[PDB]
Amino acid sequence: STGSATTTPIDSLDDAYITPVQIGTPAQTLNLDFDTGSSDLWVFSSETTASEVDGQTIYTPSKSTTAKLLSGATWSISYGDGSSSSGDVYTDTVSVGGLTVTGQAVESAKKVSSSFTEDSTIDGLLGLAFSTLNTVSPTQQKTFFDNAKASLDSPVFTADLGYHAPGTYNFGFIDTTAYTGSITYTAVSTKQGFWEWTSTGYAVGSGTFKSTSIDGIADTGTTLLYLPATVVSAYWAQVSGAKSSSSVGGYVFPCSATLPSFTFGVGSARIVIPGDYIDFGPISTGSSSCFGGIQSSAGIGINIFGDVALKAAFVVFNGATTPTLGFASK
Numbered sequence: 001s002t003g004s005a006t007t008t009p010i011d012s013l014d015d016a017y018i019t020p021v022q023i024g025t026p027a028q029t030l031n032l033d034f035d036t037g038s039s040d041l042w043v044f045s046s047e048t049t050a051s052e053v054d055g056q057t058i059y060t061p062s063k064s065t066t067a068k069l070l071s072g073a074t075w076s077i078s079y080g081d082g083s084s085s086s087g088d089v090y091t092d093t094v095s096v097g098g099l100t101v102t103g104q105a106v107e108s109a110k111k112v113s114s115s116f117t118e119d120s121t122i123d124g125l126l127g128l129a130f131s132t133l134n135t136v137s138p139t140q141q142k143t144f145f146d147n148a149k150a151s152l153d154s155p156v157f158t159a160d161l162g163y164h165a166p167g168t169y170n171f172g173f174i175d176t177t178a179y180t181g182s183i184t185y186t187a188v189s190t191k192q193g194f195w196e197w198t199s200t201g202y203a204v205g206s207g208t209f210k211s212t213s214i215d216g217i218a219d220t221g222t223t224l225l226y227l228p229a230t231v232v233s234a235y236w237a238q239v240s241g242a243k244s245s246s247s248v249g250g251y252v253f254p255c256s257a258t259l260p261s262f263t264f265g266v267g268s269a270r271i272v273i274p275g276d277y278i279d280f281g282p283i284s285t286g287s288s289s290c291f292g293g294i295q296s297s298a299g300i301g302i303n304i305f306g307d308v309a310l311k312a313a314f315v316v317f318n319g320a321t322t323p324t325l326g327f328a329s330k
């Protein structure tokens, strides 16, 4: 079996992408953020504190006939930017663009951090990392992809994010009409529970390619691209006026400057990110200073290939026994 769903940017900056998901019987459609950097499927619901919901669509367990409370199970997660959510657990039917999985763990939020409440376009998350990161206690639960793996024509899923436009999430097959040239596969380390791989190097603009190993994770749930201090400093040095701002918390540049492209290595292949992709707008309404899409990871503890890098490629997440990552131009 297979499934295909359209993913849409939440705002004109591509800060995040939402995908419609059918939950329960009869279906209750919620727009979730697909996150390959987490392994929990949580949603706003009729249980969430009333004061913590501001326009999001909620899931109503009592309205679903397939819904069933997972007695004693609880969840609690906190993300890299500090956001947090927690609540109880249910099992129910979940369909993503045709692909149906019964008995999927649906984590119902009882508490959500203020950053979530302020975000009316995101109804919840669908984690696509490795099941080892699931926070359901005391009985860990499997992810949606893990649950469908056995029924898919191919234990894979693909990410095709668009720049200032809609994209596609496919489950169980490769659309050979969606990319150009060949697909380059690279080893994945599942040790930390992430889609962790190693880039082979980089280039700034038309500069010479630098051979250097960069260890990072493929995370659709992260907006920007976070690389080592040395790499990031070399990029912004090619932009007149750019500088690291203490007050803003990152690299900023004059809104009128042209950004050079950024190249990252996949094996012997190279993926090119257009400079337009790296512009994230005025730091503040009306400002002539703009925020950069490539920032330092010196503080994170790991490099992150977020949407900024991913949307420049057709990405294959091969969940075989020996998982791999596939990158192609498009």
Ligand SMILES: CC[C@H](C)[C@H](NC(=O)C[C@H](O)[C@H](CC1CCCCC1)NC(=O)CCNC(=O)[C@H](Cc1ccccc1)NC(=O)N1CCC(N)CC1)C(=O)NCc1cnc(C)nc1N
Pocket (backbone or CB within 6 Å): 015, 016, 033, 035, 036, 037, 038, 039, 077, 078, 079, 080, 081, 082, 083, 119, 125, 133, 135, 219, 220, 221, 222, 223, 224, 280, 291
């Ligand atoms: C089981 C935890 C799980 C693995 C967890 N995983 C993650 O945090 C990675 C995951 O991909 C999450 C998923 C996000 C979380 C926030 C809401 C949207 C989804 N990603 C991040 O945290 C990346 C940092 N945040 C982001 O990149 C958000 C994403 C966003 C976009 C639109 C609207 C709202 C949020 N955007 C931005 O920060 N920016 C974009 C806008 C730009 N103008 C400002 C910068 C984790 O590592 N948590 C850290 C953690 C906490 N506590 C402990 C004890 N250990 C930990 N490792």
